[PDB]
Symmetry: D2
Subunit: 334 residues, 4 copies
Amino acid sequence: GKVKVGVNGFGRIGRLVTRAAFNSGKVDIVAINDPFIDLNYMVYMFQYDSTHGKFHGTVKAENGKLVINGNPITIFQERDPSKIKWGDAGAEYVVESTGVFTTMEKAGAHLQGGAKRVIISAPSADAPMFVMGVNHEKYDNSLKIISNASCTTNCLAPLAKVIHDNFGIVEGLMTTVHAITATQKTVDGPSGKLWRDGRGALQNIIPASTGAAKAVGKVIPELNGKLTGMAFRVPTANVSVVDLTCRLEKPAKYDDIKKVVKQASEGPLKGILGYTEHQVVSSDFNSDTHSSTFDAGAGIALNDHFVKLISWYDNEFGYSNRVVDLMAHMASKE
Amino acid sequence: GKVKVGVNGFGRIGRLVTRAAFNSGKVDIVAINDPFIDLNYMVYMFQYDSTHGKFHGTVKAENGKLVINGNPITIFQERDPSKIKWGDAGAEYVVESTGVFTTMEKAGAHLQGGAKRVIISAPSADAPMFVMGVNHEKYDNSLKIISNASCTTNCLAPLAKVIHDNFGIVEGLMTTVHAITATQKTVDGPSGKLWRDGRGALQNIIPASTGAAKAVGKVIPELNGKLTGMAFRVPTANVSVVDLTCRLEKPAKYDDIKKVVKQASEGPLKGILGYTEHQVVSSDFNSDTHSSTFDAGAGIALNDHFVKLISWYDNEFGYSNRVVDLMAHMASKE
Amino acid sequence: GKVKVGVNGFGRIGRLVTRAAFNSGKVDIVAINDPFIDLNYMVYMFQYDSTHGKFHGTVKAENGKLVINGNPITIFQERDPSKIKWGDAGAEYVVESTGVFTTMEKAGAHLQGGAKRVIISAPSADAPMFVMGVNHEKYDNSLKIISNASCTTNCLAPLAKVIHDNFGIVEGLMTTVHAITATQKTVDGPSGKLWRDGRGALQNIIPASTGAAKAVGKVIPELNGKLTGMAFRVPTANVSVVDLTCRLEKPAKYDDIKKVVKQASEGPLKGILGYTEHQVVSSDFNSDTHSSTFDAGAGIALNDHFVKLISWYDNEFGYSNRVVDLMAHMASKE
Amino acid sequence: GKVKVGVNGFGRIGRLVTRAAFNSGKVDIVAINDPFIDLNYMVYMFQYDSTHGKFHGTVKAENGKLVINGNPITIFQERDPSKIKWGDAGAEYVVESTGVFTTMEKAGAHLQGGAKRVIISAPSADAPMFVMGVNHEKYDNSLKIISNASCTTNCLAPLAKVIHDNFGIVEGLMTTVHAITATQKTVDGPSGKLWRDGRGALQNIIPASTGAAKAVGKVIPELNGKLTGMAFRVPTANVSVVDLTCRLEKPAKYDDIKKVVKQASEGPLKGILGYTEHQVVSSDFNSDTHSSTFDAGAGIALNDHFVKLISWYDNEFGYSNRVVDLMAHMASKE
């Protein structure tokens, strides 16, 4: 149901979760905290988007509040999350989207300000992790601090679930060809901890490490220790693709894989896992809200036990909608 | 002393084979045929290159000849390859680089004009196929029409050879993240036979088919039927990467894989297979003449029998230098 | 009672005129001719668009007809325009969008098949030229073959009209920073007539010639011989900008220029000439149907008689909508 | 011997000035200060460059010193510029390249550590500004703190000097189509002071303000108040172009403009101002050390008194070489 939500951070994830909330109408955004972006600039950042276009609606600054579609939103400018007066603003759930308070200890600071539950929109080292359609039924009311995993884990886990349930994944190695992100540089610049990530994003294919495939073993415990992978950052603004190479236990002809994935996309994973037989390219998934879309034509099987499965994901819009979906699911269990 | 070479086609491959021949000095280009590009335009196309820079030397049109570094080259403008007077121009070997005469029957037309041997700089449905460092010792003087396989086969085969020789490849699936090519479109355009390839190259990650992994099974017969793969075209002008996910027969710790690849790069495959432990990105391989460069840091192993190996290749420069190397080898056997 | 339209050519202009016709609902597309693109491929090309997104509606092939939003469209595959049965399909006006039948003689072939009028969606060497909001009132029922000028002319002419009407343009020089087009190459390739245009579109800023400023003197005869310009093609998939540097007769303070442009955008040029004071960038105009949008903030004046005026244009959508608007106007005059 | 130089900051300008110093051999780099980049990372950042390629020479860390081509360089890590012991390291001139100490008061801090002169590699609000080939002869030994102006001012001023000296510039408006810079963002992000500059660099043409044309009026006093302009940032990694639209006092034919520019490029402005009649595109100027290269073919004249002149500049390499040249000139006057 329509729970009141607070968003910590108005960066790429925070703005798109706010966007998804107003577009879907599943939740009500009532407060936003950002100590670095003032109200007039938030109006501009929310109104215009290079990737997803101008917001379909109205965005104004009125009496110190951000008014989206006539709905006023309280704006906070606190650096310390324990100082945010979430309860005063009426925010029941808080989306922790800054990327710097991902442990339960750090994310728990929001409970001090009056928030009832915290949803970390990033992987967490210790919080319970969820992927809608995969393990969201393991959520219960005793859980006050949870994580929605990453955009990549949300793409891989629904597909891994269907393949493992039907044929059994003996082992798998994944590659994600990922669009550019805010942490990258326009030209060769400093990135002290991750040297390759400092190289010009526009000119390069950049290998990167990702714990997304390993994280699938947390949301699907039977796949713990059976998956790992890496990423390549390429010069596209949005939409990424997962390439899963795996060994199956039971033999599976490629048409049998297509059949079970199509069945899952039409039934229990409708809206989360998509299925296509069309000649799609990455831009066909811009602003697509699925977590994962299986590309039947792009995948290839060496034999009945060794296949490469391809799945597209709008790394911005799929994930943002899953955060709203997770919160709406949580509200139904209150 | 060096073999005199004729080049059919002054497209991307033809110009870069000509550049490799003058840069390496291993062979002498004496004739070029192109029915659509006149002498003045050939000077311009060879002199300036967006990817590899201005040619390191002199290029001018003098008395109807293309003069590169003081060497005059006879220019032909024939549409029918059987009409090119290669013998008159002194061209002993002909590089068939147009991409439209890839069968032994079609490529054989150059023998009518006086050429002694033909090297198809592309895969052929029936010509004997070679990869330098892998099976070039299987070449013999009776072979008048041969193929140098594709750029991607030249990246995968040297790495597959080392891995198979030391550990044994039970099976493998490859993905190549490939730079854009001349067959792609700037904006969504017609590509009747391959619909995805007509979509805008600048805006998209495009899945594509490739027979390069399967072709490794022809150059390394022990791997016949054991490898397959696909490609993703991404918006970079040059430099591609191979991602080989394979299952090994003998156990191999990742440090053992690094050791054998490094050994091969320093010895028998020197200049063909490279090895790096540096934090490299694609642009670090621009104008690199190796067929394949193993990126030790980028690869990942799930266990001692299931690994993902990463190898970079300048899809233009590496291959064009191998065409010149193959010719130099053929000349030594005359 | 909307006019029934036939579209010759399903290239980027033809598809976008069809998309504009269904989106605006001003005209009814009843027939499309393209000898190289079959019905199944037309569904794909219309449905998916890298730049403007998936078509918002339904598009399917049903009993040899292209059905868009339940409206069946007859499909022809004729190479000779005089052989197209436009009359049998019910097409009253024909949009000549192939770019190869731009003279009165060539475009007139469509009248043989039963079309009543022909609108060339490109500049013509001899047909009367129109720009909506500038000289569309000079159209009369005796004109069976007309031209809608080019996208750059449709951007410059509405702005030049307002400036000349209020202050008088003594002389002007225009630069257009233009997005990439279908005539460009992905990598350095052959472009025999225009050498710079063959260079890789993704890697370069390419200077190019344009007769668009000179052609403003044909639609606004008072400006004949007073304007010229050039273009720079840059690696963006869509949206271009005009930069008009002109010498004014009457003194014009920058706030007076803003006032008259804003007035025109709200009144007679509503929908054609836009006006903004927002901090916009090119993506803010993606799928914007205006011919020209004056950017108040980007412009600069040296003195009251020498200014640089900036106007954005979606080179694809704005022009397409003007083709539809021109045909709707012609229909009102029947 | 050659003057010994210290470089404050190892960002894009600092590294490329160091690269220019070793490549040209005009000055000796003996010390570098950067409080955020450690020695091992400096080796990596200097050795590999996506834009200009791997450094032509040797670079290694040895005994806490950066050794380039056998020359050891002392490395400092000071946040306060008054604390850098330039005198101890033997640094006579200091290049202030951080972009944050551009006033004479702030840049003067380097004199406290023992530096004799400071060259600000950026525009300064109060320091004397110089452009090589334009006003470098106005430098004298009493000037301890000077500025080398900006990369755009160094492109425009040599061309403006030739045009004004021969024909007289009554007034001029400039546009620079500029490659992407380190201050831009990969995806829509925060840029509080300049909102348009925070928009995604890969997806957009971004209008920007520049004082570069106005600054030409300081280096060439008889052009004060006669020039202004603006910029468009476009998605290319390097090389930019100046488009000068100017009114001339003495009416000149375009061939007369070509003649005087060619003459200047062959004589007094040799190596500073280039001249070409070739069909060049931006990539043809990658790693070109000229400040400005007049493109004869790209420019357009409306009449004998109103012209648009085009000049290319490698915004990275041209400017860095002028910093070195300015210091070599200062050394000759000691």
